[PDB]
Write a protein that binds this ligand. Structure first.
Ligand SMILES: CN1C(=O)N[C@H](Cc2c[nH]c3c(Cl)cccc23)C1=O
Ligand code: NA
Length: 247
């Protein structure tokens, strides 16, 4: 259903529930409430869960589960190493989360390392901290991970393939431990370049990355959306690969 909370329950912004504990909060009616109920259905181990909603007078808030190590780029850039089997696992979990989301008919629209949260055991959950998947709540950025068909075309409707492109770039970032396109002159020219086929510099992946993940990332950022696999297709390939060579 969906849990209406009050602000007296507490002591993006961290928030401290008096009975439930640590939560995160994005501070922003039948319609907002209804949207929130729809989002409340997204329940999966790899998906940041909507725990509650605060609808009061001078403030509207969405309340989500806390993830202890922050976003994925933060963890990737940490002074402490992140092993290959663990990166493979993170990829597998991202794939599971995305498949579940598309399975509920939800297209993310803004998947990127910031929207990939990480717990203390380096397990991940997909988030939507910018509310890209929302309609009513978003009303009240970097394009490194945005499919070319959306670049310079804000009216085209985003599909599951859009999220697959973002996923491709995320694979790249996972192996390079940084943002792509550091050599770019300016955003305009960069946008035209990516629209015409430019992609993250694979040579800028210095540490070891299996050739088939390089293959996967190249498949997933194909210019033609229909040449990209779905997330279940990706899983179909990647899971037995992960187990058999990585786990
Ligand atoms: C914005 N907030 C989240 O980060 N997780 C919950 C649930 C949620 C709504 N849309 C989501 C997408 Cl697109 C991905 C993961 C969770 C969600 C939420 O409402
Ligand atoms: Na730029």
């Amino acid at each position: 259903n969906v849990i209406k909370m009050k602000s007296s329950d507490f002591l993006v912004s961290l928030a401290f529930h008096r009975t439930q504990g640590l939560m995160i909060m994005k501070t922003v009616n039948e319609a907002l409430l209804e949207e929130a109920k729809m989002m409340n259905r997204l329940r999966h181990s790899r998906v940041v869960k909507l725990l509650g909603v605060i609808i009061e007078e001078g403030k509207y808030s969405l309340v989500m589960e806390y993830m202890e190590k922050g976003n994925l780029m933060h963890v990737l850039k940490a002074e402490m190493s992140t092993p290959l089997s663990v990166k493979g696992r993170i990829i597998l979990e991202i794939i599971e989360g995305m498949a579940y989301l598309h399975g509920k008919g939800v297209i993310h629209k803004d998947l990127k390392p910031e929207n990939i949260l990480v717990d203390n055991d380096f397990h991940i959950k997909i988030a939507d901290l910018g509310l890209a998947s929302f309609k009513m709540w978003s009303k009240l950025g970097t394009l490194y991970y945005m499919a070319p068909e959306h670049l310079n075309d804000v009216n085209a409707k985003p599909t599951e393939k859009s999220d697959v492109y973002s996923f491709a770039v995320v694979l790249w970032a996972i192996f390079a431990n940084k943002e792509p396109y550091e050599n770019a002159i300016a955003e305009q020219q960069l946008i035209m370049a990516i629209k015409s086929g430019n992609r993250p510099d694979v040579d800028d992946i210095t540490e070891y990355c299996p050739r088939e993940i390089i293959s996967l990332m190249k498949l997933c950022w194909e210019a033609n959306p229909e040449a990209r696999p779905t997330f279940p297709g990706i899983e179909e390939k990647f899971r037995p690969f992960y187990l058999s060579q990585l786990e």
